[PDB]
Amino acid sequence: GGITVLTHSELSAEIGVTDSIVVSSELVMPYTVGTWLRGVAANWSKYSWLSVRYTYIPSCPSSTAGSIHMGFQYDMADTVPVSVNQLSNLRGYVSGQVWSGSAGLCFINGTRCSDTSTAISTTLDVSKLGKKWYPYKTSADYATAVGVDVNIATPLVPARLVIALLDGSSSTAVAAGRIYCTYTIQMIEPTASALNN
Amino acid sequence: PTQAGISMAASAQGAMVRIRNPAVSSSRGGITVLTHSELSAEIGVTDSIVVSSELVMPYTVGTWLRGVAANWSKYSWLSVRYTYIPSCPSSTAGSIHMGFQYDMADTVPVSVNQLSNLRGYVSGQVWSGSAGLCFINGTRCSDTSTAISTTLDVSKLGKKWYPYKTSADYATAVGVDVNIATPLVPARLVIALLDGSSSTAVAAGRIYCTYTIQMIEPTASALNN
Amino acid sequence: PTQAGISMAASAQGAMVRIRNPAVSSSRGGITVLTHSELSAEIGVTDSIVVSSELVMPYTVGTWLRGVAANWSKYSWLSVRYTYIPSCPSSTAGSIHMGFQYDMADTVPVSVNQLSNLRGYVSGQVWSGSAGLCFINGTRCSDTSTAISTTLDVSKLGKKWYPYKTSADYATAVGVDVNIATPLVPARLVIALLDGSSSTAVAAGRIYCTYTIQMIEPTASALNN
Amino acid sequence: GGITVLTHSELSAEIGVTDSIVVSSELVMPYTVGTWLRGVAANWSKYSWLSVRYTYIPSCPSSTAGSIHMGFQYDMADTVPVSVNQLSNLRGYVSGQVWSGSAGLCFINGTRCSDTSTAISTTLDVSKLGKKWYPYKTSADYATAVGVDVNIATPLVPARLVIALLDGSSSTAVAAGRIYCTYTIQMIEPTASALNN
Numbered sequence: 001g002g003i004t005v006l007t008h009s010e011l012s013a014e015i016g017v018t019d020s021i022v023v024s025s026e027l028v029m030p031y032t033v034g035t036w037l038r039g040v041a042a043n044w045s046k047y048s049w050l051s052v053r054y055t056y057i058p059s060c061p062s063s064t065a066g067s068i069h070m071g072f073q074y075d076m077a078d079t080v081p082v083s084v085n086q087l088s089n090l091r092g093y094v095s096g097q098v099w100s101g102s103a104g105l106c107f108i109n110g111t112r113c114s115d116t117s118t119a120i121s122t123t124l125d126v127s128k129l130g131k132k133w134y135p136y137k138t139s140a141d142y143a144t145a146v147g148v149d150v151n152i153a154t155p156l157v158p159a160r161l162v163i164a165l166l167d168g169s170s171s172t173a174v175a176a177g178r179i180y181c182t183y184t185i186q187m188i189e190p191t192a193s194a195l196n197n
Numbered sequence: 198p199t200q201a202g203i204s205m206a207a208s209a210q211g212a213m214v215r216i217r218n219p220a221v222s223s224s225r226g227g228i229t230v231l232t233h234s235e236l237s238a239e240i241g242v243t244d245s246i247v248v249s250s251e252l253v254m255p256y257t258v259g260t261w262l263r264g265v266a267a268n269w270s271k272y273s274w275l276s277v278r279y280t281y282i283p284s285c286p287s288s289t290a291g292s293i294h295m296g297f298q299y300d301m302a303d304t305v306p307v308s309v310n311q312l313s314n315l316r317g318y319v320s321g322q323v324w325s326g327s328a329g330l331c332f333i334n335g336t337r338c339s340d341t342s343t344a345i346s347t348t349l350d351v352s353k354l355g356k357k358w359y360p361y362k363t364s365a366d367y368a369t370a371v372g373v374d375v376n377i378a379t380p381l382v383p384a385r386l387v388i389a390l391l392d393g394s395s396s397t398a399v400a401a402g403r404i405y406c407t408y409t410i411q412m413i414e415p416t417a418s419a420l421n422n
Numbered sequence: 423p424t425q426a427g428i429s430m431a432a433s434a435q436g437a438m439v440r441i442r443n444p445a446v447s448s449s450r451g452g453i454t455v456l457t458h459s460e461l462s463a464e465i466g467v468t469d470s471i472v473v474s475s476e477l478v479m480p481y482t483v484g485t486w487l488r489g490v491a492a493n494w495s496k497y498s499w500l501s502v503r504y505t506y507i508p509s510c511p512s513s514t515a516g517s518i519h520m521g522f523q524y525d526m527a528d529t530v531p532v533s534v535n536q537l538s539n540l541r542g543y544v545s546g547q548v549w550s551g552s553a554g555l556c557f558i559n560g561t562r563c564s565d566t567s568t569a570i571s572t573t574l575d576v577s578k579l580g581k582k583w584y585p586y587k588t589s590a591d592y593a594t595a596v597g598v599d600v601n602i603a604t605p606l607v608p609a610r611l612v613i614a615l616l617d618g619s620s621s622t623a624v625a626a627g628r629i630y631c632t633y634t635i636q637m638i639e640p641t642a643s644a645l646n647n
Numbered sequence: 648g649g650i651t652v653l654t655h656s657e658l659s660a661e662i663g664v665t666d667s668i669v670v671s672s673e674l675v676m677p678y679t680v681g682t683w684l685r686g687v688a689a690n691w692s693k694y695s696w697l698s699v700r701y702t703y704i705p706s707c708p709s710s711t712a713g714s715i716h717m718g719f720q721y722d723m724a725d726t727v728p729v730s731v732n733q734l735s736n737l738r739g740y741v742s743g744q745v746w747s748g749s750a751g752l753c754f755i756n757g758t759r760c761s762d763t764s765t766a767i768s769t770t771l772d773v774s775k776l777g778k779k780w781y782p783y784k785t786s787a788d789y790a791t792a793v794g795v796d797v798n799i800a801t802p803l804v805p806a807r808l809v810i811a812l813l814d815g816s817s818s819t820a821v822a823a824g825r826i827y828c829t830y831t832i833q834m835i836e837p838t839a840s841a842l843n844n
């Protein structure tokens with residue numbers, strides 16, 4: 001009672017596949033997970049992750065050279081991996097060919113999952129996060145805060161998803177796949193949409 | 198002491214310290230447990246009061262622990278204990294004082310009194326506390342009613358899970374505003390030394406820390422700040 | 423394959439890698455055992471032969487292992503395995519080659535042939551070896567007759583106990599004379615890549631290393647060179 | 648057969664006690680353990696440690712403020728501890744009041760040891776040393792070798808004993824105690840005395 005529990009699955013990020021190891025990162029918070037949730041979660045001041053799961057889903061030919069990597073960092077102050085190696089250490093390291101993972105599909109439509117060993121997907125260890133409840137922060141205000149000092153962020157966001165997309169066959173981008181997020185969340189302490197930062 | 202109430206003060210106390218190999222265990226689920234002891238600080242006493250403070254976080258507590266916990270993003274204190282060992286004669290004059298604070302913004306105590314109020318307070322002659330040895334070496338404990346050592350009440354701190362921070366980056370963040378610190382470290386140890394006999398510092402003792410930590414969510418040692 | 427002798431080549435192979443949490447255990451006596459897996463190197467193939475070499479010592483093997491073993495003065499390899507995973511299509515042209523050398527003074531191989539002679543040699547199409555996945559993830563192993571992965575014969579090296587060395591200081595010592603190295607590192611991995619189709623390097627695969635190490639005689643992380 | 652086994656106990660180093668943490672180090676090899684052994688071991692080319700044990704023995708008043716520390720390093724390349732803290736980490740860390748340890752005495756005369764818990768003394772973990780057999784090296788030639796590069800030493804000496812003598816009551820030295828070494832050694836491959844380096 002009091003809370004509100006949404007459980008959904010939307011595209012979290014489109015992936016381009018190249019040959020020069022490009023390394024990105026997304027905060028594991030509502031405003032960043034995806035457009036849809038970003039829209040809802042706003043109506044609630046704080047929230048708590050219950051089950052966060054990013055899953056890669058291909059959309060390219062089998063003749064598409066390339067591998068993708070995912071992992072998690074938690075002390076926002078830490079330096080985002082420079083080498084994919086450094087990345088393979090993080091919690092929940094995972095990596096497969098940018099055209100495989102077809103099987104992970106059963107995480108997005110919420111169907112009965114058969115064998116998920118071939119699925120390029122990792123989860124968030126919710127039990128080991130700083131706070132139980134976090135404040136809904138807008139990318140804007142967040143940046144402004146990390147501008148003064150990054151550490152002021154450790155209490156605004158639970159973790160960060162480190163993504164690496166190396167190995168390709170061309171110097172320019174080639175559409176490869178998408179990373180959808182399948183989360184279960186508890187939204188609380190409602191608020192006017194435009195009053196959230 | 199044979200009878201009851203009678204006490205004999207030695208010319209000087211002596212405790213032979215021997216630290217046993219570390220204890221590490223990767224318990225499925227993520228956490229890696231480490232329990233070890235290290236010489237945390239060197240002590241000196243003067244006729245005028247002196248207040249020393251040390252953050253009770255990985256990078257600061259242990260010199261070995263620093264390099265170890267580096268490979269993990271977070272940690273949770275499970276048991277932190279600062280024990281005191283006198284390396285001087287009973288003919289020495291002086292007393293020690295310890296306690297904890299939890300909001301770095303609070304000013305650092307300046308009177309043996311203010312300090313008497315802090316959590317887990319402890320006082321005692323600079324030349325006593327040898328009793329606490331059994332803690333550091335890790336043997337069977339006898340009469341500890343005479344020992345000078347305190348423990349961090351891990352039971353009630355900000356979070357259970359704190360981020361591994363580096364003295365450097367830490368200070369940088371505290372430079373902005375001290376307050377940014379509360380979400381970076383649980384508490385800190387306060388240490389006072391007065392009732393000494395000379396204006397020039399005298400060899401008092403040393404403080405060893407014996408802790409048990411939980412380390413989680415791995416990371417390349419050098420990617421950690 | 424249903425019958426026997428018949429083999430079907432896929433348009434492309436795929437292996438979903440998932441590295442499990444490290445395994446650490448402080449076994450009384452001194453040694454601290456660590457068994458973990460890490461992405462050791464990125465691969466690329468060209469029409470002309472290319473010989474890459476990597477020292478098989480802590481600081482070099484693993485990026486996590488680097489920060490870990492730092493807290494111990496020595497170590498003994500117990501099982502080192504370099505596995506290869508193809509991240510490309512069977513339509514790709516190219517083969518890989520690996521083996522070990524033990525005297526850094528020996529010149530680095532320059533022919534796929536010379537390399538065929540080295541210890542624990544292995545060859546195979548750039549797009550194969552997916553079979554070896556079960557090694558890295560650490561699952562139940564099936565048919566590995568098709569996998570591209572080799573192991574270091576820890577059974578016979580200079581010493582059982584080597585000193586933790588740092589790339590920096592190491593090189594400095596090798597600068598004096600390479601030979602000073604033999605008592606600093608067991609052996610090294612040789613890796614060749616030829617039979618490719620373009621002058622400009624192409625995404626081949628990647629090599630993960632899965633090792634089990636013994637670490638001993640503690641030291642402050644920063645006092646180690 | 649062939650070998651030769653000496654087991655002895657002689658003064659390895661006199662100790663001065665001060666207030667400014669002075670940190671020394673001695674190689675755990677024949678030429679350095681002590682004068683007597685240095686003299687014998689020379690007649691043999693190589694040798695192997697069987698049981699090395701440094702023991703501190705007081706020789707001062709009980710009114711002598713001070714503590715002593717001992718430990719071991721093995722990668723001769725490592726930087727000798729700068730702080731006693733750093734020292735308390737090494738294998739076999741030990742430390743007690745510079746006037747205690749009276750009990751350790753039973754290690755020097757080889758008598759029946761009662762309770763040795765109060766003895767300031769540590770041992771060498773022989774089972775975990777690089778080589779089984781080492782070459783007898785003279786301080787001279789050793790320095791000359793470490794002059795070119797320290798690493799050229801890891802194969803000449805098994806380990807190094809790090810000793811710290813902090814906490815005192817005076818700015819100048821005060822005779823405190825001695826560190827005797829009680830070793831069991833295997834001397835081999837004999838040689839003319841003056842031909843050993």
Ligand SMILES: [Ca+2]
Binds near residue numbers: 045136137138196197
């Ligand atoms: Ca908000």
Ligand SMILES: [Ca+2]
Binds near residue numbers: 077422
């Ligand atoms: Ca950190």
Ligand SMILES: [Ca+2]
Binds near residue numbers: 495585587646
């Ligand atoms: Ca070293």
Ligand SMILES: [Ca+2]
Binds near residue numbers: 692782783784843844
């Ligand atoms: Ca010689």
